[PDB]
Amino acid sequence: PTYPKYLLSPETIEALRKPTFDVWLWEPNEMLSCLEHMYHDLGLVRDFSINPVTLRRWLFCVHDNYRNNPFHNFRHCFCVAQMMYSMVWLCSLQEKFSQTDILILMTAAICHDLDHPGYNNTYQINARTELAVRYNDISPLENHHCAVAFQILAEPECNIFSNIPPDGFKQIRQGMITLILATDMARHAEIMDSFKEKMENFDYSNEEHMTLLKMILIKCCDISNEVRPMEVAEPWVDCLLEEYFMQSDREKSEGLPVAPFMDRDKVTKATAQIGFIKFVLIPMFETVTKLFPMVEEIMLQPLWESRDRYEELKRIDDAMKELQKK
Amino acid sequence: KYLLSPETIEALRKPTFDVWLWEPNEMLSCLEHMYHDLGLVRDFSINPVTLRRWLFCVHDNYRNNPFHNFRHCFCVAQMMYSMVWLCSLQEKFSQTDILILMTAAICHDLDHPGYNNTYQINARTELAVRYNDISPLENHHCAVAFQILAEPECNIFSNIPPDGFKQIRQGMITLILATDMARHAEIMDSFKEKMENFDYSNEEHMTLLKMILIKCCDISNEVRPMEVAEPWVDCLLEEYFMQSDREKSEGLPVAPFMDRDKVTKATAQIGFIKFVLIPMFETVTKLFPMVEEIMLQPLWESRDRYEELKRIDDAMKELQKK
Ligand SMILES: C[C@@H](Nc1nc2c(cnn2C2CCCC2)c(=O)[nH]1)c1ccc(Cl)cc1
Ligand SMILES: C[C@H](Nc1nc2c(cnn2C2CCCC2)c(=O)[nH]1)c1ccc(Cl)cc1
Ligand SMILES: [Mg+2]
Ligand SMILES: [Mg+2]
Ligand SMILES: [Zn+2]
Ligand SMILES: [Zn+2]
C-alpha cells in the first residue's frame, strides 16, 4: 500500500545525503524520522549502543524545546543537522574523524539553538535580561542552548548516551560545549583567524587542529542556507528578516540601540545577503575547500551564483529607487 | 558594639586586623566605612542608606559554610582595603578601578554552596549543567551579585551613568571569574609576561594586575598574624572534608589533598604557601616593594612554623604505626 509519511521512502533516504535536499517539503514527524535515520546510518546507534527507543524520545524532546520563532526554530535545527550529514558524505569525514567526533558534530548541530527566544545576544545584554544576568554577558544564548541540551540528556528517558562510559561522556560533553559555544557570531573573526593560523600547516593528528576544524564545520552548517538551491534558500531570508525586524521594532519601542543591519527601514533582502555571502560565507568555505577540494563545486558554486543574483537584484532595487526620485 | 571605635577604624587599614573579634553587624559597619573612606560614596553618589541595605542583602546571600561564608567575604574585602593603603593604589588606579576591586571582593563568593567546581562537574549538578562546566561557581557568584544590584533599594550604582555601569560590570565579572583557582597558573603566566615590561597606562596590563590583586586577597589568610590565620585552616579542612566524605559515599573521585585520611593542617598549608602564595606575592613585590616586609614576611614565618608542626606530626605517627 501507501506507507505513512513517517516511513521514509528510499528516494528520500538517498536525497537526504545531499545538500540539495528540500527542507521545506517535510513536516516535523518526517524531519524527526530523517534525523533518526542519520544516527542509524552513520553507525552511531551501533557504536555507542544507543537505545533506538531512547533516540526517538530524545528527538521528540529536542523538538519540543525549539520555539516557534520565524527563523530560529526546529526546521533551522533540521537544516543545520542535515547539512552536517551532507558534509560527512561529501568530505568523507568518517575517514578523518573518529565516531565520537561524528557524534559530537551531529548532536551539537541538532542542539545548538535549543530554546532560542528570537532575540539575539545584543538584545539580551542591552536589555539586561535574566539570561544576560545569568551568564554575565558571555555568549548568553549559546550558553543557554548548551545548558538546555544537557538538561534534556540528563532525563533518563532522553539520555541517548546512557550506555557510554563516563570517560566517553565527558569527552562528548566537552566537545559539544565547544561546538555550540563556537556558533556565537560575535566570535566569527576570532575563530576564523585561529583556523587560518593552523591551516598554514594542518595536522589531522593534532587535537587542537581538529577542534578548530570541527568548530568551523558547525559554523559552516549553521549559516549554510545560501549553499542550498535558490528555491530552498530564498524563503529563509524572509524568515530571518521577520525575526530580526521583530527585535529592532522592540528595541525602538524600549529605547534600546538598533543595529542598522537589522533595521526594518534600512534593510532589503539583497542588502541582508550580499556582504554576508561575500565576506562571511565565501571566505569561510574557501578555507574549508583547501582541505576538502570537492566543496568548491558543491558549495562554493551555489554561493557564487547567489552572490551574483543578489548583487543584480540590488542594482535593480537601486535603479527603481533612483527612478522614483529623478 | 554597633558603633566602631576610632581604634577599630584605624586598625581596619592593616592586614593585622583581627577578623574574628566581630559579629556580622560590626563587619557590615566596617565595610560601609571602607566605601566612605575610599571616596567611593562621594565620587559615585552612592546613596548612604542604599549602601547599608546593599551590604545587608549581600550578607543575607552568603551561606553558613565553615569557610566560604560572610566572614571570608569580609576578610577578602578587608585585605583589599589594606592593600590600597600599603601599595598606595589610589595613585595608580582610577576611582572606578577601586570600586571594581572592592565590590568584586565583597561579592566574589556569593551563595557558595560549600562544594567546589570539581564536585559540581563530577556530580553533574544543576550549576555545572547551567554553566557548561565553565567556572560554574564563579559564574554563579557573579550572577547573584548583579541580581542583588538589580533590586532598586540595593542598587549602590543607581546614580552612575549607563556607560560607567557597563564598565564596572565588565570589570567585576573579569575579577570574580579570575578567582577560580583552576586558572591560577594561566593568570600568573600572563601577568609575569606583562611584568617583563610593566606599563600602568596599558589597560591589558592593569586588568591583569587587578586580577592578581583580588586573587592575593582571596587566598590571603596566611598573611595575617598566626592567631588570626590558624582558625581559618580548621574551617577550610572542615568544609573540604565534608566534600571528600560526600564524594566517597557517592562514588566520585577524591583528591588526595582533601582526603580526610591523608591531610593534616600542616600538609594543607606548607605546599600552598611555598608554591602558590610566596611566588605570587614575590611578583607583586616587584611592583610594590613595601609588600615584602608586610606580607612575604609572615608567609615565611608561617611556612617555617608549619614545617616544624609537620615534624611533630610525623613523630606522633611513628608512635602509632603497627
Ligand atoms: C542580515 C543578516 N544576514 C544573514 N544572516 C544569517 C544568514 C544565515 N544566518 N544568519 C545569521 C543568523 C544569526 C547570525 C547568523 C543569512 O543567510 N543572512 C546578517 C547577519 C550578520 C551579519 Cl555580520 C550580516 C548580515
Ligand atoms: C592546598 C589547599 N590549601 C589552602 N587552600 C586555601 C587557603 C586559602 N584558600 N584556599 C583555597 C580555597 C579555594 C581557593 C584556594 C589556604 O590557606 N590553604 C588545601 C589543602 C587541603 C585542603 Cl582539605 C583544602 C585546601
Ligand atoms: Mg545560535
Ligand atoms: Mg570562590
Ligand atoms: Zn543556528
Ligand atoms: Zn573566596
XYZ file of C-alpha atoms and ligand atoms in Angstrom:
702
model
C 0.000 0.000 0.000
C 0.962 3.657 0.539
C 3.087 3.896 3.683
C 2.531 6.713 6.237
C 4.782 9.780 5.923
C 6.960 8.911 8.949
C 8.173 5.862 6.981
C 10.783 7.395 4.689
C 10.911 6.225 1.071
C 14.262 5.007 -0.332
C 14.321 8.080 -2.619
C 14.159 10.425 0.368
C 16.874 8.408 2.163
C 19.104 8.903 -0.874
C 18.312 12.629 -1.302
C 18.931 13.236 2.447
C 22.680 12.641 1.901
C 22.935 15.669 -0.336
C 22.854 19.475 0.239
C 20.104 19.803 -2.394
C 17.547 18.213 -0.034
C 14.334 20.280 0.034
C 13.931 21.073 3.710
C 10.543 22.738 3.094
C 8.768 19.562 1.861
C 8.648 17.891 5.272
C 6.609 18.214 8.440
C 8.033 17.723 11.969
C 7.402 13.955 12.173
C 9.101 13.426 8.829
C 12.103 15.566 9.833
C 12.319 13.632 13.099
C 12.424 10.330 11.153
C 15.119 11.846 8.926
C 17.268 12.702 11.972
C 16.664 9.285 13.485
C 17.843 7.650 10.248
C 21.046 9.712 10.289
C 22.096 8.239 13.640
C 21.491 4.667 12.452
C 23.035 5.341 9.013
C 26.217 6.864 10.500
C 26.663 3.825 12.786
C 26.236 5.907 15.967
C 23.395 3.757 17.283
C 25.652 0.743 16.806
C 28.927 2.196 18.062
C 27.527 3.886 21.171
C 24.807 1.332 21.941
C 22.129 3.954 21.640
C 18.743 2.543 22.616
C 16.681 3.173 19.443
C 13.600 3.996 21.517
C 15.559 6.483 23.634
C 16.830 8.015 20.358
C 13.226 8.647 19.310
C 12.185 10.099 22.665
C 15.301 12.301 22.724
C 14.492 13.733 19.277
C 10.919 14.432 20.381
C 12.096 16.282 23.498
C 14.591 18.232 21.393
C 11.766 19.160 19.006
C 9.590 20.301 21.906
C 12.350 22.590 23.207
C 12.686 24.570 19.980
C 10.317 27.565 19.952
C 8.168 28.730 17.049
C 10.339 31.683 16.024
C 10.301 32.783 12.368
C 13.947 31.770 11.809
C 15.412 30.046 14.895
C 13.033 27.098 15.021
C 13.035 23.334 14.665
C 13.336 23.473 10.864
C 16.538 25.549 11.217
C 17.775 22.886 13.569
C 16.923 20.309 10.904
C 18.731 22.264 8.167
C 21.905 22.508 10.179
C 21.970 18.806 11.085
C 21.094 17.803 7.516
C 23.916 19.957 6.169
C 26.283 18.316 8.667
C 25.066 14.917 7.434
C 25.643 16.088 3.834
C 29.151 17.245 4.623
C 30.063 13.962 6.345
C 29.401 12.222 2.988
C 30.739 14.981 0.715
C 34.032 15.336 2.612
C 34.381 11.643 3.632
C 34.594 12.821 7.218
C 34.466 9.228 8.531
C 37.994 8.748 7.104
C 39.328 11.696 9.144
C 37.169 11.725 12.281
C 36.517 9.144 14.974
C 32.954 8.018 15.605
C 32.977 10.040 18.817
C 33.792 13.157 16.762
C 30.990 12.456 14.252
C 28.634 12.040 17.230
C 29.795 15.389 18.672
C 29.273 17.185 15.348
C 25.822 15.705 14.715
C 24.488 16.081 18.248
C 25.867 19.634 18.598
C 24.213 20.543 15.291
C 20.809 19.302 16.473
C 21.113 21.004 19.888
C 22.802 24.291 19.004
C 19.811 26.710 19.089
C 17.667 24.982 21.738
C 15.072 27.299 23.293
C 16.200 30.330 21.313
C 13.837 33.248 22.224
C 14.053 35.077 18.879
C 16.171 37.966 20.196
C 19.945 37.818 19.856
C 22.757 38.314 22.390
C 22.880 42.067 21.833
C 19.236 42.332 22.846
C 19.889 40.110 25.874
C 22.812 42.221 27.030
C 21.401 45.690 26.287
C 18.023 44.799 27.849
C 19.804 43.188 30.809
C 17.635 40.076 30.577
C 17.560 37.175 33.004
C 19.798 35.272 30.531
C 22.381 38.082 30.244
C 22.500 38.335 34.046
C 22.698 34.542 34.426
C 25.642 34.269 32.015
C 27.409 37.523 32.844
C 27.144 38.846 29.258
C 29.253 35.916 27.986
C 27.502 34.331 24.945
C 24.211 34.107 26.861
C 22.197 32.304 24.168
C 24.823 29.772 23.231
C 25.442 29.020 26.910
C 21.687 28.550 27.335
C 21.344 26.326 24.230
C 24.072 24.077 25.578
C 22.567 24.058 29.099
C 19.142 23.000 27.805
C 20.785 20.280 25.669
C 22.261 18.642 28.763
C 19.157 19.188 30.885
C 17.374 17.078 28.265
C 20.144 14.466 28.161
C 20.016 14.219 31.986
C 16.413 12.990 31.834
C 16.916 9.187 31.770
C 14.237 8.642 29.099
C 16.022 11.041 26.710
C 19.594 10.013 27.543
C 20.910 8.712 24.243
C 24.320 8.481 25.925
C 23.148 6.148 28.743
C 25.363 3.258 27.526
C 28.517 5.321 27.074
C 31.203 5.011 29.765
C 31.726 8.138 31.947
C 35.030 8.947 30.196
C 33.284 8.882 26.821
C 30.523 11.122 28.118
C 32.995 13.677 29.463
C 34.772 13.784 26.076
C 31.457 14.114 24.197
C 30.110 16.754 26.581
C 33.185 18.927 26.372
C 33.268 18.667 22.583
C 29.590 19.583 22.254
C 30.051 22.607 24.529
C 32.999 23.838 22.491
C 30.985 23.450 19.263
C 27.773 25.077 20.427
C 29.656 27.987 22.030
C 31.521 28.386 18.700
C 28.262 29.326 16.917
C 28.173 32.794 18.541
C 28.724 35.082 15.539
C 30.470 37.571 17.823
C 33.406 35.150 17.729
C 33.434 34.610 13.974
C 36.630 36.520 13.115
C 38.453 35.134 16.192
C 37.678 31.539 15.195
C 38.472 32.007 11.504
C 41.808 33.580 12.439
C 42.712 30.632 14.683
C 41.689 28.195 11.977
C 43.661 30.007 9.246
C 46.699 30.007 11.533
C 46.581 26.183 11.794
C 45.957 25.854 8.044
C 49.478 27.126 7.334
C 50.399 23.534 8.147
C 47.314 21.487 9.017
C 47.700 18.287 11.015
C 44.834 15.771 11.391
C 46.831 14.168 14.265
C 46.807 17.415 16.217
C 43.800 17.586 18.542
C 43.786 21.398 18.611
C 43.780 21.484 14.821
C 40.804 19.112 14.769
C 38.860 21.012 17.434
C 39.091 24.140 15.265
C 38.084 22.235 12.114
C 35.000 20.938 13.943
C 34.179 24.474 15.112
C 34.481 25.635 11.507
C 32.339 22.732 10.300
C 29.439 23.538 12.631
C 29.746 27.247 11.859
C 29.523 26.345 8.141
C 26.374 24.260 8.612
C 24.792 26.872 10.926
C 24.846 29.644 8.337
C 24.686 27.371 5.254
C 21.217 28.337 3.890
C 22.715 30.095 0.850
C 24.623 26.923 -0.125
C 21.255 25.309 -0.893
C 19.446 25.632 -4.257
C 17.881 29.057 -4.749
C 14.272 27.911 -4.238
C 15.197 26.254 -0.938
C 17.328 29.208 0.298
C 15.117 32.213 -0.636
C 12.322 31.647 1.889
C 14.861 31.537 4.769
C 15.802 35.148 4.089
C 12.193 36.199 4.735
C 12.170 34.164 7.944
C 15.422 35.803 9.050
C 14.232 39.341 8.427
C 10.899 38.667 10.088
C 12.767 37.643 13.270
C 15.358 40.444 13.030
C 12.706 43.131 12.398
C 10.760 41.851 15.391
C 13.835 42.568 17.530
C 14.623 46.022 16.082
C 10.969 47.104 16.468
C 11.109 46.045 20.107
C 14.425 47.834 20.649
C 12.907 51.027 19.189
C 9.873 50.586 21.397
C 12.041 50.184 24.541
C 14.608 52.887 23.709
C 17.403 50.372 23.134
C 20.110 50.593 20.445
C 19.166 49.439 16.953
C 21.668 47.825 14.611
C 21.420 49.185 11.026
C 21.733 45.698 9.512
C 18.564 44.732 11.448
C 16.579 47.937 10.863
C 13.212 47.473 9.126
C 13.562 50.907 7.472
C 17.042 50.251 6.021
C 17.257 46.565 5.124
C 16.326 44.816 1.894
C 16.553 41.104 1.106
C 19.534 41.904 -1.142
C 21.491 44.075 1.325
C 20.843 41.493 4.053
C 22.647 38.855 1.943
C 25.351 40.360 -0.278
C 28.063 41.265 2.254
C 27.231 38.212 4.347
C 27.828 35.951 1.327
C 30.954 37.743 0.118
C 32.744 38.398 3.394
C 31.432 35.757 5.799
C 30.239 32.730 3.812
C 32.589 32.649 0.835
C 35.912 33.086 2.703
C 34.939 30.522 5.315
C 34.048 27.960 2.649
C 37.192 28.866 0.692
C 39.379 27.822 3.646
C 37.481 24.539 4.091
C 37.922 23.849 0.354
C 41.704 23.717 0.929
C 41.219 20.514 2.957
C 38.172 19.336 1.025
C 38.511 20.443 -2.630
C 35.197 18.742 -3.515
C 33.490 21.517 -1.519
C 34.259 24.084 -4.253
C 31.922 22.574 -6.826
C 29.160 21.553 -4.414
C 29.060 24.567 -2.044
C 31.173 27.490 -3.267
C 29.487 27.285 -6.680
C 25.943 27.988 -5.365
C 27.328 30.794 -3.160
C 28.896 32.482 -6.194
C 25.594 32.219 -8.062
C 23.680 33.590 -5.059
C 26.136 36.467 -4.682
C 25.704 37.486 -8.352
C 21.955 37.049 -8.138
C 21.583 39.306 -5.076
C 24.041 41.848 -6.459
C 21.947 42.072 -9.631
C 18.803 42.309 -7.504
C 20.347 45.259 -5.654
C 21.151 47.106 -8.913
C 17.535 46.620 -9.939
C 16.397 47.846 -6.494
C 18.741 50.875 -6.667
C 17.628 51.790 -10.220
C 14.000 51.522 -9.113
C 14.757 53.865 -6.179
C 16.637 56.295 -8.385
C 13.667 56.288 -10.793
C 11.206 57.421 -8.093
C 13.491 60.369 -7.287
C 14.791 61.649 -10.653
C 29.041 47.499 69.681
C 27.285 48.680 66.520
C 29.412 51.866 66.571
C 33.031 51.346 65.583
C 35.626 52.930 67.874
C 38.442 55.065 66.421
C 40.915 52.311 67.372
C 38.973 49.844 65.207
C 38.588 52.245 62.290
C 42.354 52.728 62.453
C 43.184 49.007 62.806
C 40.922 48.271 59.793
C 43.581 49.667 57.412
C 46.112 46.982 58.265
C 46.463 43.250 57.473
C 46.902 42.622 61.213
C 43.206 43.411 61.828
C 41.641 40.662 63.979
C 38.784 39.468 61.777
C 37.478 37.075 64.477
C 36.518 39.715 67.040
C 33.479 40.990 65.244
C 29.910 39.965 64.642
C 28.045 40.422 61.337
C 26.660 43.901 62.122
C 30.075 45.295 63.045
C 31.620 43.704 59.950
C 28.870 45.363 57.924
C 29.741 48.670 59.583
C 33.419 48.139 58.744
C 32.577 47.577 55.072
C 30.363 50.640 54.940
C 33.191 52.699 56.407
C 35.540 51.473 53.675
C 33.222 52.817 50.951
C 33.000 56.224 52.609
C 36.696 56.313 53.484
C 37.874 55.405 49.956
C 35.810 58.240 48.421
C 33.509 55.825 46.586
C 30.283 57.142 48.150
C 31.391 60.643 47.243
C 32.621 60.012 43.700
C 29.765 57.688 42.632
C 26.968 59.489 44.501
C 26.158 56.268 46.290
C 23.063 56.778 48.409
C 24.272 56.209 52.005
C 21.195 54.186 53.038
C 21.244 52.084 49.840
C 24.882 51.206 50.681
C 23.773 49.716 54.005
C 20.805 47.833 52.541
C 23.084 46.505 49.796
C 25.575 45.198 52.377
C 22.749 43.638 54.374
C 21.431 41.928 51.256
C 24.910 40.765 50.330
C 25.253 39.304 53.844
C 21.891 37.574 53.509
C 23.133 35.836 50.331
C 26.230 34.303 51.891
C 25.674 30.821 53.333
C 26.801 29.309 56.638
C 29.610 27.156 55.296
C 32.556 26.521 57.568
C 34.892 28.512 55.262
C 33.055 30.093 52.315
C 30.901 32.384 54.436
C 30.297 36.080 55.069
C 33.368 36.435 57.316
C 35.542 35.121 54.442
C 33.969 37.774 52.237
C 34.841 40.326 54.926
C 38.444 39.090 55.111
C 38.956 39.469 51.389
C 37.450 42.949 51.249
C 39.396 43.992 54.361
C 42.654 42.719 52.820
C 41.890 44.620 49.591
C 41.313 47.756 51.667
C 44.642 47.147 53.422
C 46.429 46.750 50.107
C 45.016 50.044 48.865
C 46.931 51.820 51.676
C 50.010 49.632 51.763
C 50.534 49.975 47.994
C 49.067 53.486 47.574
C 46.749 52.127 44.906
C 44.880 55.445 44.599
C 47.936 56.911 42.810
C 47.863 54.106 40.244
C 44.144 53.376 39.835
C 41.103 55.426 39.000
C 38.259 55.500 41.479
C 36.297 53.299 39.072
C 39.028 50.667 39.358
C 38.975 50.967 43.182
C 35.203 50.475 43.180
C 35.559 47.392 40.974
C 38.230 45.907 43.221
C 36.242 46.472 46.411
C 32.816 45.494 45.112
C 34.184 42.354 43.451
C 35.950 41.417 46.683
C 32.718 41.680 48.656
C 30.681 39.754 46.063
C 33.147 37.113 44.885
C 31.742 34.065 46.780
C 28.066 34.963 46.926
C 25.805 31.947 47.584
C 28.710 29.497 47.628
C 27.250 26.025 48.351
C 30.315 24.585 50.143
C 31.448 22.172 47.418
C 33.968 23.300 44.789
C 33.841 23.217 40.966
C 35.362 19.736 40.770
C 32.399 18.412 42.753
C 29.890 20.403 40.706
C 31.276 18.987 37.464
C 31.931 15.389 38.544
C 28.474 15.166 40.179
C 26.861 16.880 37.170
C 24.987 19.314 39.377
C 22.442 21.890 38.351
C 25.143 24.606 38.441
C 27.629 22.653 36.342
C 24.881 21.988 33.801
C 23.777 25.648 33.823
C 27.334 26.873 33.164
C 28.663 24.047 30.979
C 31.487 23.096 33.318
C 32.962 26.620 32.812
C 33.842 28.074 36.239
C 30.336 27.264 37.469
C 30.761 28.676 40.992
C 32.398 31.922 39.930
C 29.776 32.497 37.204
C 27.096 31.901 39.842
C 28.608 34.347 42.403
C 28.706 36.964 39.698
C 25.120 36.339 38.590
C 23.922 36.625 42.185
C 25.902 39.881 42.610
C 24.026 41.512 39.706
C 20.693 40.015 40.699
C 21.209 41.850 44.010
C 22.244 45.102 42.293
C 19.160 44.861 40.051
C 16.986 45.368 43.132
C 16.444 49.165 43.231
C 16.695 49.516 47.011
C 20.009 47.575 46.859
C 21.434 49.354 43.825
C 24.521 51.204 45.002
C 25.174 52.061 41.317
C 21.782 53.704 40.719
C 23.445 57.124 40.194
C 26.213 56.002 37.886
C 25.624 56.767 34.199
C 24.987 53.657 31.999
C 28.452 53.790 30.399
C 30.005 53.756 33.865
C 27.791 50.869 34.979
C 28.818 48.796 31.964
C 32.486 49.436 32.674
C 32.054 48.450 36.325
C 30.019 45.355 35.445
C 32.637 44.172 32.940
C 35.403 44.792 35.452
C 33.631 42.976 38.282
C 32.917 39.968 36.028
C 36.541 39.689 34.982
C 37.770 39.854 38.581
C 35.273 37.431 40.110
C 35.858 34.878 37.308
C 39.577 35.328 37.897
C 39.194 33.842 41.425
C 38.687 30.308 40.021
C 41.934 28.633 41.149
C 41.870 26.340 38.115
C 43.140 29.398 36.201
C 45.895 30.247 38.694
C 48.939 29.200 36.639
C 47.462 30.688 33.443
C 46.818 34.076 35.079
C 50.199 34.091 36.779
C 51.945 33.307 33.467
C 50.028 36.095 31.704
C 50.935 38.559 34.446
C 54.633 37.593 34.557
C 54.770 38.104 30.792
C 53.481 41.696 31.291
C 55.892 42.121 34.200
C 58.724 41.759 31.695
C 57.972 45.444 30.957
C 55.007 46.636 33.008
C 53.049 49.692 31.866
C 50.473 51.343 34.160
C 48.762 53.023 31.187
C 48.272 49.724 29.329
C 44.681 48.649 30.116
C 45.513 44.997 29.465
C 48.392 45.234 31.978
C 46.109 46.850 34.579
C 43.354 44.299 34.097
C 45.847 41.553 34.887
C 47.162 43.449 37.910
C 43.653 43.799 39.302
C 43.055 40.071 38.720
C 46.241 39.363 40.679
C 45.168 41.721 43.463
C 41.771 40.106 44.071
C 43.487 36.728 43.884
C 46.046 37.806 46.506
C 43.211 38.932 48.777
C 41.066 35.819 48.247
C 43.760 33.401 49.444
C 45.475 35.810 51.890
C 44.554 34.238 55.275
C 48.176 33.148 55.906
C 49.500 36.702 55.530
C 47.612 37.587 58.697
C 49.105 37.056 62.206
C 49.225 33.403 63.264
C 46.472 33.692 65.870
C 44.104 35.178 63.266
C 45.201 32.843 60.476
C 45.197 29.429 62.221
C 41.452 29.095 62.835
C 40.821 29.577 59.097
C 42.697 26.338 58.430
C 40.321 24.381 60.688
C 37.406 25.912 58.788
C 38.996 25.042 55.484
C 39.556 21.387 56.358
C 36.099 21.156 57.867
C 34.468 22.366 54.646
C 36.732 20.353 52.361
C 36.436 17.115 54.363
C 32.648 17.443 54.119
C 33.035 17.308 50.315
C 35.513 14.420 50.190
C 33.250 12.453 52.572
C 30.357 13.051 50.204
C 32.415 12.223 47.118
C 33.453 8.911 48.655
C 29.910 7.839 49.528
C 28.686 8.817 46.027
C 31.494 7.033 44.152
C 33.084 10.229 42.785
C 36.833 10.789 42.599
C 38.552 12.272 45.691
C 41.617 14.477 45.530
C 44.339 13.308 47.930
C 44.813 16.940 49.051
C 41.264 16.962 50.523
C 41.320 13.387 51.796
C 40.357 13.295 55.486
C 42.616 10.252 55.967
C 45.661 11.872 54.306
C 45.548 15.566 55.218
C 46.993 17.429 58.187
C 46.721 21.133 58.971
C 50.445 21.415 58.175
C 50.465 19.422 54.896
C 47.484 21.512 53.764
C 49.492 24.751 54.128
C 53.214 24.152 53.544
C 52.967 23.474 49.811
C 50.265 26.085 49.347
C 52.433 28.749 50.994
C 55.622 27.755 49.192
C 54.389 27.205 45.645
C 51.262 29.419 45.467
C 51.330 32.294 47.947
C 55.013 33.158 48.196
C 55.644 33.254 44.427
C 52.506 35.303 43.801
C 53.429 37.952 46.396
C 57.041 37.937 45.107
C 55.782 39.035 41.673
C 53.542 41.658 43.272
C 56.521 42.847 45.348
C 58.450 43.728 42.158
C 55.799 46.399 41.589
C 55.237 47.173 45.270
C 58.417 46.620 47.326
C 56.641 47.537 50.585
C 54.700 44.241 50.165
C 57.806 42.195 51.048
C 58.045 43.210 54.693
C 54.301 43.376 55.418
C 53.158 40.195 53.635
C 56.001 37.944 52.478
C 57.493 38.094 55.974
C 54.508 36.452 57.742
C 54.379 33.885 54.910
C 57.997 32.925 55.621
C 57.235 32.604 59.326
C 54.093 30.553 58.674
C 55.967 28.292 56.292
C 58.669 27.672 58.917
C 56.162 27.120 61.707
C 54.113 24.585 59.709
C 57.283 22.729 58.739
C 58.037 22.471 62.469
C 54.491 21.302 63.216
C 54.881 18.690 60.499
C 57.951 17.191 62.226
C 55.938 16.709 65.416
C 53.003 15.306 63.455
C 55.440 12.861 61.832
C 56.997 11.857 65.160
C 53.486 11.183 66.517
C 52.787 8.850 63.557
C 55.999 6.937 64.406
C 54.417 6.158 67.815
C 51.160 4.944 66.183
C 52.230 2.646 63.322
C 51.984 -1.135 63.730
C 21.238 40.387 7.754
C 21.994 39.115 8.160
N 22.059 38.189 7.029
C 22.087 36.870 7.201
N 22.242 36.310 8.411
C 22.253 34.973 8.535
C 22.111 34.155 7.485
C 22.174 32.915 7.968
N 22.351 33.011 9.285
N 22.392 34.209 9.606
C 22.576 34.801 10.932
C 21.528 34.345 11.908
C 22.255 34.527 13.212
C 23.673 35.052 12.827
C 23.873 34.329 11.596
C 21.947 34.649 6.251
O 21.804 33.923 5.260
N 21.933 36.037 6.095
C 23.300 39.384 8.608
C 23.738 38.835 9.817
C 25.018 39.085 10.293
C 25.890 39.885 9.567
Cl 27.536 40.190 10.188
C 25.457 40.435 8.361
C 24.176 40.182 7.879
C 46.115 23.322 49.138
C 44.912 23.902 49.906
N 45.378 24.819 50.967
C 44.845 26.020 51.152
N 43.861 26.475 50.379
C 43.343 27.692 50.569
C 43.781 28.504 51.530
C 43.050 29.618 51.428
N 42.185 29.458 50.421
N 42.367 28.310 49.914
C 41.715 27.547 48.795
C 40.188 27.678 48.867
C 39.934 27.590 47.403
C 40.897 28.631 46.840
C 42.140 28.034 47.427
C 44.773 28.103 52.338
O 45.218 28.801 53.250
N 45.319 26.842 52.154
C 44.138 22.953 50.577
C 44.711 21.886 51.271
C 43.898 20.981 51.964
C 42.506 21.133 51.982
Cl 41.448 19.968 52.873
C 41.940 22.209 51.302
C 42.750 23.117 50.613
Mg 22.658 30.378 17.672
Mg 35.412 31.384 45.162
Zn 21.734 28.394 14.315
Zn 36.886 33.320 48.162
